[PDB]
Design a protein around this ligand. Structure first.
Ligand SMILES: [Mg+2]
Ligand SMILES: [Mg+2]
Ligand SMILES: [Mg+2]
Ligand SMILES: [Zn+2]
Lengths: 40, 99, 152, 38, 39, 174, 177, 160, 97
């Protein structure tokens, strides 16, 4: 849904493609340490 | 083979009953599923159908708030259809630019 | 308008008398319009239910008025005559029941008695679908996205 | 009486009308001119 | 002219006793929507 | 109340004794059945509202029989009514104006000559019988090599149908 | 929430008695809404296995209207089962013989073809007239609105509406009418 | 007297839906400010109770609270008993209010903490492929790894 | 004054935005059920009448159709099943929460 809208706005048609919804890290240590990158 | 082939059917059936629950909840709040999802996407909320259904079930107040948001976005879209430019864009129709 | 009466022992008197002639409103919204629909912006924005203007183009018995006197387009005249047939068939005009010595119904193009029943409906690709409304009102503005479905 | 797809007025007295869902042609002077629409 | 609790029930007696239970929970602070336990 | 147009009258039950002849003024013969009426009491009345039918209904009994070979509820009904048992209890549709009190005997004088009537009753039990004498089929001939096929029904239905139409005439209890 | 387990489950999976008036409304639309509510799509806890249906009541089924000449050309057809038992009847004759059967068959077609169809159809209730038995007009909850609007008659249009609506043209005086 | 575009009242002379008008943007900004102010003040006072939050994790969304379990169909490379902070959250909701992002919320506003409880191989799933009258029959067994977490606590920041 | 939805049946809802406009907030206090939209609630000579003991038992068809009409369902589900299904039924099923 909304793929063409996202395209004309400048975002990925599928939000899983790129952007902060997928590129950010999905887990880090509670002490504030950065987790290693995901293979994806 | 049926155990294998039933997996994607499970996927589809659950998606269908999620969307049906959501359509019902919206229609009893006064909205329709297509406009609801379009408005939410335009307002930048990526809530998939399963959590939308769980929200509509367990916390109807929050689902009602989401429906209100979607309706206001519909009305902003109608004002924009009247005048695309030459006007102040909708407050919720505004988007965030990332880089 | 004029009212005629034919009335005495062995003698009879026929007489026609003028009557009160109503008039239109003094502010036509759209000048340079030869038909009333164009003078008032009513070309594609009327139906059977909005009978207020239909009551203007009918006789007390329920008869249609002539184009030569009413001053309408041919297309609009046939539009309103079909629409008035629809209204009568729905029964919205009880006072105009013509002259003398059961079922609810609406949106009926043709007459009820004339139509024969379809004892068989064909397959999907050549089905005998049921008519509704008329192609005449097809041009009417449709606020909905889907168009008017005239044949069920 | 006879049924024709296309109708034709044989004489001026023949008059064509639309009755009970179909086109008819009636002539009282020449009844044999009566003509149904198929 | 002010509500404290409502209760569903098969019968009116069950409904009113359940409403009493709800009000008691609300007053004692053991509502299901209470602050979780801090560790 | 007196008779009115369209009204009806309660029927009754009788016992068939047999047949005998009758002769007319013209010398013509007419066979005629005798119908005997022993007790023929009324049993029950209903309202057309209670019944929810097109017309009110009464109940009439037939023959008095042993009070021993019945059910306890039926015997209670017959006692609280006051009359003995009746092996048959039939129903008669009737207008409301013709309401009759229970416990009233129905004698044969309800009818008169020069009158027409209808009669319903159970048929003679022939049991499980053949298609021919049940329905009236011709059957099959006897000679010309008919191999154990004389009184059979023959065919039943077509081949494409692959089944048998309900309501078909075959042997059964007659 | 702060509710008890069994009472909460009961209140969630409870049934409801809805009412709708079919006077001058289309059987198709009213039966469609009734059917969705019978199988229970309207509630967000819908599942086929969970019998979460609701009881429905239609009112004034006799006073329904079709769109078009359907009263004449629509044919309800049924085979009794015997040879020549193929019967066809217009909606008009079928309404005269049984004013409820139209809406009944409509919902029977709208509904899914599961064994729950009969259960839902007996949940549903129908009455051709403005009259209802005591218990089944007592144990109601809500009357949902109608699908379509009723166009008004000239005897119904008040005078102020008429004189506000402008007259369109001036007739010549010399006309019999 | 009548505007040219004027039209009498009929069935479809105007749309079927009711006419609507949006409020003034200045008054609306004032309203936004008032609502945000009161919400921040109330959550600082500590009126709320439980907190349910949505989280994007393992390529999919979940609704979670504190003291609740969650399963994921992959291996994280985390020793059991260890704690982690979940970053992505679509919204957070309490009994009287909710906060949802565009798309997601800020890092400083929330802090979702989850502990690892269990690492397992999934129960044996079977993959059989069969085609008809071509002796095409094949099977395989898979035991996907799966990790169990428990959401231990959620707290929000007054920052807003 | 402009409202998106009628705030009279579940909760009085309002939306709002941060100053930067990156997060939305909703304030949705539930509704208080008015008092006005409510309803109010509802052998002598001798003993042993308190027994009030009446025993009626029907046979299969009548009782099943009676209780089916009373629960608004069909007669089919009421008929018993066979030992096959009775023993295949799991007796101690899992339960959650
Ligand atoms: Mg022979
Ligand atoms: Mg041989
Ligand atoms: Mg032989
Ligand atoms: Zn001729």
């Amino acid at each position: 849904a909304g793929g063409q809208w996202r395209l004309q706005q400048g975002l990925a048609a599928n939000p899983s493609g790129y952007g902060p919804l997928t590129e950010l890290p999905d887990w880090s240590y509670a002490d504030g340490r950065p987790a290693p990158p995901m293979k994806g | 083979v049926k155990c294998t082939k039933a997996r994607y059917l499970k996927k589809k059936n659950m998606r269908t009953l999620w969307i049906n629950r959501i359509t019902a909840a919206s229609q009893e709040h006064g909205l329709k599923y297509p406009a609801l999802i379009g408005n939410l996407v335009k307002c930048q909320v990526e809530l998939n159908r399963k959590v939308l259904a769980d929200l509509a079930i367990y916390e109807p107040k929050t689902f009602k708030s989401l429906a209100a948001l979607a309706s206001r976005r519909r009305h902003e879209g109608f004002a924009a259809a009247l005048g695309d430019g030459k006007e102040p864009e909708g407050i919720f129709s505004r988007v965030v630019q990332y880089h | 308008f004029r009212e005629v009466v034919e009335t005495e022992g062995k003698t009879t008197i026929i007489e026609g008398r003028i009557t009160a002639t109503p008039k239109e409103s003094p502010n036509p919204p759209n000048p340079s319009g030869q038909c009333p629909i164009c003078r008032w912006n009513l070309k594609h924005k009327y139906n059977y239910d909005d009978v207020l203007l239909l009551s203007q183009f009918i006789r007390p018995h329920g008869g249609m008025l002539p184009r030569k006197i009413t001053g309408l387009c041919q297309e609009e005249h046939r539009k309103i005559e079909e629409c008035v047939k629809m209204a009568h068939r729905a029964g919205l005009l009880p006072n105009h029941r013509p002259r003398l010595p059961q079922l609810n119904r609406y949106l009926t193009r043709w007459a009820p008695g004339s139509v024969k029943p379809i004892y068989k409906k064909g397959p999907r690709w050549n089905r005998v679908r049921m008519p509704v409304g008329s192609p005449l009102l097809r041009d009417n503005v449709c606020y909905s996205r889907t168009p008017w479905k005239l044949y069920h | 009486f006879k049924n024709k797809t296309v109708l034709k007025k044989r004489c001026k007295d023949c008059y064509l009308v639309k009755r009970r869902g179909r086109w008819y042609v009636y002539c009282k002077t020449h009844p044999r001119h009566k003509q149904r629409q198929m | 002219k002010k509500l404290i609790a409502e209760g569903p029930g098969e019968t009116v007696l069950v409904a009113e006793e359940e409403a009493a239970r709800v009000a008691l929970r609300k007053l004692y602070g053991f509502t299901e929507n209470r602050r979780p336990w801090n560790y | 109340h007196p008779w009115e147009p369209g009204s009806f009258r309660v029927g009754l039950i009788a016992l068939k004794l047999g047949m005998m002849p009758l002769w007319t003024k013209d010398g013509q013969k007419h066979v005629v059945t005798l119908l005997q009426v022993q007790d023929c009491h009324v049993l029950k009345y209903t309202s057309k509202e209670n019944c929810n039918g097109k017309m009110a209904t009464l109940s009439v009994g037939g023959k008095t029989v042993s009070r021993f070979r019945k059910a306890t509820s039926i015997l209670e009904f017959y006692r609280e009514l006051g009359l003995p048992p009746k092996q048959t209890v039939k129903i008669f549709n009737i207008t409301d104006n013709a309401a009759i009190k229970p416990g009233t005997p129905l004698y044969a004088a309800h009818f008169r000559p020069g009158q027409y009537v209808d009669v319903t009753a159970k048929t003679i039990g022939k049991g499980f019988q053949g298609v021919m004498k049940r329905w009236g089929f011709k059957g099959q001939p006897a000679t010309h090599g008919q191999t154990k096929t004389h009184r059979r029904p023959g065919a039943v239905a077509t081949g494409d149908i692959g089944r048998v139409w309900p309501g078909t005439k075959m042997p059964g209890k007659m | 929430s702060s509710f008890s387990r069994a009472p909460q489950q009961w209140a969630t999976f409870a049934r409801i008695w809805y009412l709708l008036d079919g006077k001058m409304q289309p059987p198709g639309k009213l039966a469609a809404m009734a059917s969705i509510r019978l199988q229970g799509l309207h509630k967000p806890v819908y599942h086929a296995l969970s019998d979460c249906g609701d009881h429905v009541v239609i009112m004034n089924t006799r006073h329904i209207a079709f769109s078009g000449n359907k009263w004449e050309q629509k044919v309800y057809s049924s085979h009794t089962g015997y040879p020549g038992g193929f019967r066809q009847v217009t909606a008009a004759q079928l309404h005269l013989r049984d004013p409820v059967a139209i809406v009944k068959l409509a919902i029977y077609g709208m509904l899914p073809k599961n064994l729950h169809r009969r259960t839902m159809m007996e949940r549903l209730h129908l009455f051709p007239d403005e009259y209802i038995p005591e218990d089944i007009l007592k144990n109601l909850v809500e009357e949902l609105p109608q699908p379509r609007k009723i166009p008004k008659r000239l005897d119904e249009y008040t005078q102020e509406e008429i004189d506000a609506f402008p007259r369109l043209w001036t007739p010549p005086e010399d006309y019999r009418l | 007297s009548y505007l040219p575009g004027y039209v009498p009242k009929t069935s479809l002379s105007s749309p079927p839906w009711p006419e609507v008008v949006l409020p003034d943007p200045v008054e609306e900004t004032r309203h936004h400010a008032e609502v945000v102010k009161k919400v921040n003040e109330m959550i600082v006072t500590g009126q709320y109770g439980r907190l349910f939050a949505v989280v994007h994790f393992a390529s999919r969304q979940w609704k979670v609270t504190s003291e609740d379990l969650i399963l994921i169909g992959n291996e994280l490379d985390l020793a059991c008993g260890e704690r982690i902070r979940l970053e992505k959250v679509l919204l957070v909701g309490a009994d009287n209010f909710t906060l949802l992002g565009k798309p997601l919320l800020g890092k400083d506003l929330v802090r979702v903490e989850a502990t690892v409880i269990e690492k397992t191989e999934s129960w044996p799933r079977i993959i059989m492929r069969f085609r008809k009258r071509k002796n095409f029959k094949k099977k395989r067994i898979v035991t996907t790894p799966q990790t169990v977490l428990r959401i231990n606590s959620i707290e929000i920041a007054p920052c807003l | 004054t402009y409202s998106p939805l009628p705030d009279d049946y579940n909760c009085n809802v309002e939306l709002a935005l941060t100053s930067d406009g990156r997060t939305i907030v909703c304030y949705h206090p539930s509704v208080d059920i008015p008092y006005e939209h409510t309803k109010p609630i509802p052998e002598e000579t001798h003993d042993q009448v308190l027994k009030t003991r009446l025993e009626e038992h029907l046979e299969e068809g009548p009782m099943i159709e009676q209780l089916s009409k009373m629960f608004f369902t069909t007669k089919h589900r009421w008929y018993p099943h066979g030992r096959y299904h009775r023993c295949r039924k799991n007796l101690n099923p899992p339960k959650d929460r």
